[model samples]
Target chain A: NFMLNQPHSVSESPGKTVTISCTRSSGNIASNYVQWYQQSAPITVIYEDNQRPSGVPDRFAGSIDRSSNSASLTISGLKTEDEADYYCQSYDARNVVFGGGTRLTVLG
Target chain B: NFMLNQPHSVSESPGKTVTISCTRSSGNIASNYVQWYQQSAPITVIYEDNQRPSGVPDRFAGSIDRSSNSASLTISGLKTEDEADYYCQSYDARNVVFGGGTRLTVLG
Candidate 1:
């Protein structure tokens, strides 16, 4: 079983951009679609690789980097309201996996 | 988008069974498969409605109640390790949705 590794926490000033990376331990990061969830609202912001659900701002985007074997959730124009724990999710043939979660502190 | 509503929290003793309910606000609960995720270690315990992932114990089960228009995750023989926030997830025609999350406390 592979684990998704992420930074324990990250901080960014409002209006800046912060990217949280989830690196796969073994498989290719692009092998499956990655989903992003916000702990504050407990909702899915991005799913199916990078599709933002309705009501989710375009500032939240998901991307994959093959070179690093990782997926990323990038939040641009960050706001204080965005301060929360963010988690990335993916699935293998049988099991679904998630990152340890990153605590995003949006400093004013 | 329909909402998945879960209780804010619930508590049970070790070796007991606790069922967390996720009720759909609009669509039929059985219309799509619901997944149950544990937030402490952050892994999907049940997906595709009622199937447990390979490493998940049989004590964890998922079911849908058509009468209540809700899905449920029942954890039996609970252990202290099971103490965590549990969230239910499902998707509609356009996007995926998640429950507000239920904090499960396993009291010794």
Candidate 2:
């Protein structure tokens, strides 16, 4: 099992890239797959381990660091419309775990 | 690894008990913890394997059948506010899997 956390609020300028990190505690990251979701008007997938879901913009990417038990989701060319909450989710051996969630505020 | 599904829509008279079931494909049910969530504009936990989240009504209960790889969530004395989409989520050996979800409609 691992404990995860995310920034309460992240402010980024338009057209700039921002990265949200999810760190696990004493877990095997390689065996676990992380997923990122966007909660706007409706819940949608932004990226799943470098694979973007259908209709997701090309600006999103996902990566993992096995040694540190950490995963990241990066968004590029942020737009004013990109402001929303982001959540990192993964499955431990026994339960589905979610990060606290991040509120991304795109500022011009 | 297992797959899960729920009814598209379920209708029950107010005060009637309803049971929603989630079946896995081939996995050790005892090793995996099944969780139930209610999505009504905002997501919230209803029951996590017989344990209710804070402020959840006592009408909710959860149980599992290890022999059949099945888990069920029951709600008693259903109220109009209980009308919402219910989802079953669990962790597999590799990733998190969510059931298709069930929409419950309470009728008079």
Candidate 3:
């Protein structure tokens, strides 16, 4: 039972790669799948723990290292339109939890 | 994504009742549990349908009708504090799907 705001914020230029992390203290990252969502007003999922949804480009990737109780999402060859708030989600016996959210800023 | 369709907003008078629905097409809701969250800033889980979470008032109830492939959050005796965004979520295969989020407005 934590606030789940794992990532602070990150800034990167176009064409560069960025990886935003989701650090957890209360949940098991290995047993549970972490889902990542991208949003503007309403949210649209981009990756669910390294699994990309159909039509989503290959630039998006998710990773989780259960040994460290952490997960991450990486965006390759970033674009300005790719800038948005991202969230990592997981569920436990009682409920589903979401990361406070990461604000990805694609610099000019 | 046609994965989930939820009302953009719903209004109700204080002390009344309102139900916010999240409808999905996939067979996931029928097999998996549907969860609800209350978002004031970062969201918090109110119900998981699989079970209940602590600190959530009994007024916050969650239900799913798999035959219709729909889930809902019912707020009874709604209060001014309950005037926030509500989102329903369920997993499809491995992806976590979220509704458009219904802005519950406590009207006069």
Candidate 4:
């Protein structure tokens, strides 16, 4: 089965940083096309593995560490608006899978 | 090269069909593949687009239009349970982009 692993929840403070991982199981993580999304009311594409969409700020970045078999999304200089859930997604021919998402609490 | 334009909301009656369009700028629709997903109810509940995960039904259909560089998700035989937010997704240059979801209401 395909799996996108992420912690269920975490806490952060404004002006700090947070990192979320999207790990895959033994046979998964086969795609080079990992993507990241942030959602409060509407979902926004923050990164496509390493590229930020047209309007995203530089604070968010995405990468995959081969040895760990996981993708990482790191948000630096967190803001109050970053108090939302983050999701990672990938599509393999067999299926398209998204991470369970991480809810970040920002007590700015 | 990836942006999806979608309406903010739409409505339909039970047993009718509803079509939600995802117009793309930069001609990404020529790729001929678009994915759709639905977020239903109270929040955080998500499901795969057409050709969905094992438990999802066949009522959701995903299509594309090359001439207009657009895509569509049609829900046929609308039911009360179908009220939800619908999104269209595409992959380009190893990146993922999603339409601003449409809140669709199925009036009972």
Candidate 5:
């Protein structure tokens, strides 16, 4: 039961930018980079679309804030295609950890 | 990102027991429990079928060996659905980590 705490609410309009953040309690970020993925229903298998296996969009960017031990995924030019649950993943050399996942809803 | 090392192949007959293992480098397995998910083609969003959100089967069991930083998922009485890409995920309170994934092929 890996629990990820994502923001309950993050709003952005069309053509605007929205960023979702994921934080881990005590994992090494440098050793293991953060990855993002998009999840939908019916399709149980997650697509590895992002540059990284995490499914992060090209417009969507990600980086690890070592100071806060937080990793952030940013989506630019919001689109309906971007509306889905986003998850941040990383491997600390031992096991993989996943964030609770953030649900992104694009508003017209 | 997060790299999970999974066995390339694991073969078992019907009504047999099979166990797959995942090893992390530095993440905390206790705080971040291991989750398993099944992935097929065409469909993208992974299903949360297992006791954990990782999509593990009920017959499947999981545990973390902190001493070796290893997590294992076991499946009993193998079924067809049980034959898919099994991934192990965990969160170290900072970011999520995923194994490279194990491809399980069941034999009749």
Candidate 6:
């Protein structure tokens, strides 16, 4: 019974790092594993909080910030190819919920 | 390297049924579980192939058609509220892939 909230957008220079946060409304962010997806390709980049998929680069990482009741996806050495919308996902008893989606812009 | 193909859109009147399909390009459709998601609130209506989540109605059902090497999500007795985009998801060795997304229009 919670909504995963994310920022509307984030911009970073190429080769810099950008972190997207997913904050839950009414429950412990750590209670369930969080998954991250890139909307352009519609692929799961990170699942079970921090486990990166096999083909995904090391630059993409995920984590849970218990104190903030949120999950985070950090992309390092941002590349223009990585510029895409991202969403965080988690499931509860009733259903699975996704963040509103954050658009990432890798500035030149 | 593979793709999940879905029809772009489908329309049906209320009380009728519609079937949205997800066909994989190069794998056995039964090799992995297929999940279906509704995009209004973006919730998982079917997971592990055909299991309905707790609050999802029985009208939504999923099945894998081995003969066709595809997965199907059949929404029966469709209502106006069911008019939304639907996506089918499945896993590969390295990551999860989603279908192209099918928009359902519930005609009055």
Question: Better model by TM-score, 4 or 6?
Answer: 6
Q: Output the better candidate (2/4) by TM-score.
A: 4
lDDT of all the models against the reference?
0.86, 0.75, 0.73, 0.73, 0.61, 0.87
Go through the candidates in order and give each one's DockQ. Answer: 0.02, 0.01, 0.03, 0.03, 0.04, 0.03
**Model 5 chain A poorest ten-residue lDDT run:** A40-49
Chain A only TM-scores, each candidate in turn = 0.95, 0.88, 0.87, 0.86, 0.74, 0.96
Q: After superposition, how far is residue A3 of candidate 4 from its true place, in Å?
A: 0.6
Q: What stretches of model 3 exceed 4 Å from their correct place?
A: A40-48, B1-108
Let me know the TM-score candidate 1 reaches against the reference structure: 0.52
- Candidate 1 CAPRI category: incorrect
Task: Count the clashes in each prediction.
Answer: 0, 0, 1, 1, 34, 0
Residue-wise lDDT of candidate 5 within A61-97, one digit each (tens)? 6666778767787777776545566777767666777
Q: Which of the two, 2 or 6, has more lDDT? A: 6
| Stretch of 10 with least lDDT, candidate 3 chain B | B42-51
| Per-residue accuracy of model 2 over B28-51 as CA lDDT, tens digit each | 666778888875033445445667
Could you give candidate 6's per-residue lDDT for residues B1-108 as a string of tens digits?
456777879999999999998876554778888999999367999999999999999999999987556899999999999999999999887788888899999998
Query: Please, what is the TM-score per model?
Result: 0.52, 0.48, 0.48, 0.49, 0.42, 0.52
Clash-forming residue pairs, model 4 = B36-B49
Evaluate fnat for each of the predicted models and list the values in order. 0.00, 0.00, 0.00, 0.00, 0.04, 0.00
lDDT string for model 2 (A1-108, tens) is 554556667889999999887765334556677888888253656445677888888898888876445788888999898898888877877687787788889986
Per-residue C-alpha lDDT of model 4 across residues A12-98, encoded as one tens digit per residue: 887788889989875546454788887614345554578887646577788888888899888897665455678888777767778
Model 2, position B60: C-alpha lDDT score: 81
What is the CAPRI rating of model 6's predicted complex?
A: incorrect
Candidate 6: segments with Cα more than 4 A from true spot: B1-108
Error of 4 at B78 (Å): 27
In model 4, the runs with Cα more than 4 Å from the true position are: A28-30, A40-47, B1-108
> lDDT (0-100) at residue A66 of candidate 5?
74
How many clashes show up in model 1? 0
